[PDB]
Amino acid sequence: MKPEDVIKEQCARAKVVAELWHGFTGGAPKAALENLVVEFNKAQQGRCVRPVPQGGYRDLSTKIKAAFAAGKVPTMAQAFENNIALYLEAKALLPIESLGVKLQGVNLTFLNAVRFGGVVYGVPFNKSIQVLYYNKDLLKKHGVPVPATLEEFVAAAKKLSRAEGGPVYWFQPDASTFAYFFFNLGGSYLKDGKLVLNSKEAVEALTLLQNGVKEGWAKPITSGYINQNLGSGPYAFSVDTSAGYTYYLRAAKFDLGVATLPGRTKGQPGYGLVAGTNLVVFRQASKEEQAVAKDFLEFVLSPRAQAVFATATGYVPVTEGALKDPVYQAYAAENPDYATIVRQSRYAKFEPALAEWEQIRFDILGQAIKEAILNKADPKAALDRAQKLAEDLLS
Ligand SMILES: Nc1nc2c(ncn2[C@@H]2O[C@H](COP(=O)(O)O[C@H]3[C@@H](O)[C@H](n4ccc(=O)[nH]c4=O)O[C@@H]3CO)[C@H]3CC(O)(O)C[C@H]32)c(=O)[nH]1
Ligand SMILES: [Cl-]
Numbered sequence: 018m019k020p021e022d023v024i025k026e027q028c029a030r031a032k033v034v035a036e037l038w039h040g041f042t043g044g045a046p047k048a049a050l051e052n053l054v055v056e057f058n059k060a061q062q063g064r065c066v067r068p069v070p071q072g073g074y075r076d077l078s079t080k081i082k083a084a085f086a087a088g089k090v091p092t093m094a095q096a097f098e099n100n101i102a103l104y105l106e107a108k109a110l111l112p113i114e115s116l117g118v119k120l121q122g123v124n125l126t127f128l129n130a131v132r133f134g135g136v137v138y139g140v141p142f143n144k145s146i147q148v149l150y151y152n153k154d155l156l157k158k159h160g161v162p163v164p165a166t167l168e169e170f171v172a173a174a175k176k177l178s179r180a181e182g183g184p185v186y187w188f189q190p191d192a193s194t195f196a197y198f199f200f201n202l203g204g205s206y207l208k209d210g211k212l213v214l215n216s217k218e219a220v221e222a223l224t225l226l227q228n229g230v231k232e233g234w235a236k237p238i239t240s241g242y243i244n245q246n247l248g249s250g251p252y253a254f255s256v257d258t259s260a261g262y263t264y265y266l267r268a269a270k271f272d273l274g275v276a277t278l279p280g281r282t283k284g285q286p287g288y289g290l291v292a293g294t295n296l297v298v299f300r301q302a303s304k305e306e307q308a309v310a311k312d313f314l315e316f317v318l319s320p321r322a323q324a325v326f327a328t329a330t331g332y333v334p335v336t337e338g339a340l341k342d343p344v345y346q347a348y349a350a351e352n353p354d355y356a357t358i359v360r361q362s363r364y365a366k367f368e369p370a371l372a373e374w375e376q377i378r379f380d381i382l383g384q385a386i387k388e389a390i391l392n393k394a395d396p397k398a399a400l401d402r403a404q405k406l407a408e409d410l411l412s
């Protein structure tokens with residue numbers, strides 16, 4: 018009996034069902050969301066949440082776009098910050114605090130990210146940070162310390178690739194990976210409020226990756242997630258979402274390590290890109306459905322719900338009181354990786370929250386990165402094309 022089976026039956030019996038549209042395709046994130054829901058549904062006399070898998074996150078936002086066209090939104094959905102911006106154009110979203118959800122104790126950063134014109138429109142739910150995954154066996158074999166600096170990391174990847182006869186730094190030629198290099202080379206996406214894709218730090222970041230491929234230390238991963246490609250060739254390092262944790266753990270036929278990101282200097286870890294999603298509540302929802310969402314959101318922000326969800330997945334607990342929860346404490350005591358994810362979460366950058374940012378990051382920025390990495394397009398020429406297509410789109 019799967020938790021989605023148990024939820025179907027809970028909702029079948031319920032007098033009020035609040036649909037939650039999500040983009041977990043499976044693994045620990047889908048399971049942890051459904052187990053959270055099963056528990057919530059059991060505490061409710063005939064009031065239920067129905068999680069509805071919509072595919073991945075981009076399938077989800079396309080489904081929500083169609084639901085606006087059709088004029089039938091769910092009660093709740095996962096949303097990135099740029100998706101929340103796009104939804105506020107449609108005036109589609111309920112202010113969270115007006116629902117009566119108490120947000121004191123939520124990570125102020127995570128709260129900053131969902132705050133539009135001073136009003137909170139989302140609940141931070143499954144917020145991830147990039148971390149450095151590494152092959153502890155391979156570093157130990159060659160006496161290679163975990164790199165604390167970008168310079169050390171490049172050196173370590175060169176040294177290991179030469180030793181193992183293959184590129185040991187594995188990356189997705191995508192916007193998320195580029196963000197790690199761009200941010201830690203001093204890059205910023207907004208220059209006096211203008212979106213800039215082709216800044217000298219963007220060229221530098223894309224040039225570092227393209228050179229890492231040419232020099233034999235970086236391996237572009239073009240089919241599946243990094244964690245789906247493990248076992249094919251020597252692997253030392255990736256920079257990847259904390260949500261990948263359980264997937265790396267299950268796949269890896271080596272002792273997986275997690276470290277904070279290499280930074281400019283030893284004074285501080287690199288910044289990681291914040292990913293994952295916020296829950297939003299749609300205005301179109303009935304008052305009955307809204308009240309279910311209010312109680313579901315208070316439940317999701319409870320220390321225990323956060324502790325269980327975060328330790329199950331490798332998401333970052335969004336509340337102060339989650340770290341004070343004994344279930345969290347007992348996992349952290351046994352597994353140094355949860356502290357390592359939380360500590361990395363102090364060094365956290367966000368992509369722009371422009372309504373068009375989802376199209377830009379995949380169709381424009383993502384494509385330029387692929388052109389440079391996969392087709393050896395000149396990094397500046399690739400990014401200057403991206404900057405023009407973005408400017409066109411935003412005009
Ligand atoms: N649609 C849309 N997507 C966006 C936006 N900004 C960022 N992203 C995507 O957020 C994913 C990160 O969110 P996160 O919750 O940290 O991690 C995901 C999965 O990535 C990760 N995962 C899943 C399966 C697996 O085998 N391995 C694994 O690591 O687990 C989670 C749940 O599926 C990136 C990944 C991307 O999908 O390639 C593009 C990025 C946006 O604005 N819109
Ligand atoms: Cl699965």
Ligand SMILES: [Cl-]
Nearest residue numbers: 191192379383
């Ligand atoms: Cl992608």
